[PDB]
Amino acid sequence: FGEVFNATRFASVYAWNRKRISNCVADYSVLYNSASFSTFKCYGVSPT
Amino acid sequence: KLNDLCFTNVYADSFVIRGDEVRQIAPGQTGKIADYNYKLPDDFTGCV
Numbered sequence: 001f002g003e004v005f006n007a008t009r010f011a012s013v014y015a016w017n018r019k020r021i022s023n024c025v026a027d028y029s030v031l032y033n034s035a036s037f038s039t040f041k042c043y044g045v046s047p048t
Numbered sequence: 049k050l051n052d053l054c055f056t057n058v059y060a061d062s063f064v065i066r067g068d069e070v071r072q073i074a075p076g077q078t079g080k081i082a083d084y085n086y087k088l089p090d091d092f093t094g095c096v
Contacts, residue, residue, distance in 0.1 A: 048078060
């Protein structure tokens with residue numbers, strides 16, 4: 001998650017880049033813990 | 049319609065908070081101040 005979030009350069013919006021995370025253990029807890037995000041909002045699911 | 053209601057008593061919970069963390073002061077809100085310092089019940093009746 002740090003690689004996609006703290007990447008050096010995100011592609012531009014017309015060619016947005018789609019990374020495929022798979023076969024791993026994600027800890028979304030630290031995502032909504034960190035305050036570096038102005039918006040962190042989910043649909044069909046609750047971060048908690 | 050507050051001027052034509054009679055309540056048993058009123059509770060003024062007063063404090064000072066961050067500028068943009070205001071909208072955490074509401075029922076069902078999740079985040080910094082809601083879940084660490086002060087939250088409102090989901091059956092909350094009253095004004096902010």
